[PDB]
Write a structure and sequence with these properties.
It is classed as lipid transport. The chain is mainly α. The chain contains 7 helices and no strands.
């Protein structure tokens, strides 16, 4: 029992780590979801050119486990980061009272949920499901274009979104425990959903500030 202004501080980082993990999910789902629909979509542009028929030569066959992959994948992550968004908010403020390890604890949780989204089993699933060939051409037909372009763009964008989110996650969570442990300062603002990414970069580790500016 020691009321003062700790509930406000804890509530800060609470949404911080959530803003990142949540931002990575929306971008992670866009790529994956774009791969499946983009596979049959691209192939169609090729056939429609003249053939005008389309089929399930692979675009559909792959689209099956594709959408289903990211589905259950993000389904857990998103559902977690979300439910934890508000939960952790009142959980961290209620844990600080009794003096718990919500700080080091959240680190084990956040990293857990990230290990999933960050590690899309679907990426290696489809990749290994075929194997016997790398990023290149070997089908002769014009279909290799959409396929190859999709194979590369798939893992490409996937790592493109996780690339930054990965470095930021290491910085946020890092300074996080340091903020509650060191206790540098405390702010009072019921941040709902307005420039949450901007305000974060301004008070985040020396690396996100670069993106905060270059991002209307």
């Amino acid at each position: 029992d020691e009321p003062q202004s700790q509930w406000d501080k804890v509530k800060d980082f609470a949404n911080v780590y959530v803003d990142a993990v949540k931002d990575s999910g929306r971008d992670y789902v866009s790529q994956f979801e774009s791969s499946s629909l983009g596979q049959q979509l691209n192939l169609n542009l090729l056939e429609n050119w003249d053939t005008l028929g389309s089929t399930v030569s692979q675009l559909q066959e792959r689209l099956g486990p594709l959408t289903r992959d990211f589905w259950d994948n993000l389904e857990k992550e998103t559902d977690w980061v979300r439910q934890e968004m508000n939960k952790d908010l009142e959980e961290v403020k209620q844990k600080v009272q009794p003096y718990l390890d919500e700080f080091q604890k959240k680190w084990k949780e956040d990293v857990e949920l990230y290990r999933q989204k960050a590690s899309p089993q679907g990426a290696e699933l489809q990749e290994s499901a075929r194997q016997k060939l790398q990023e290149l051409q070997g089908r002769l037909s014009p279909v290799a274009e959409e396929f190859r372009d999709r194979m590369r763009t798939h893992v490409d964008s996937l790592r493109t979104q996780l690339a930054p989110h990965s470095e930021q996650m290491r910085e946020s969570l890092a300074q996080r425990l340091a903020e509650l442990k060191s206790n540098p300062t405390l702010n009072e603002y019921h941040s709902s959903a307005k420039s949450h990414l901007k305000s974060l970069g301004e008070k985040a580790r020396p690396a996100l500030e670069d993106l905060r500016h270059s991002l209307m």
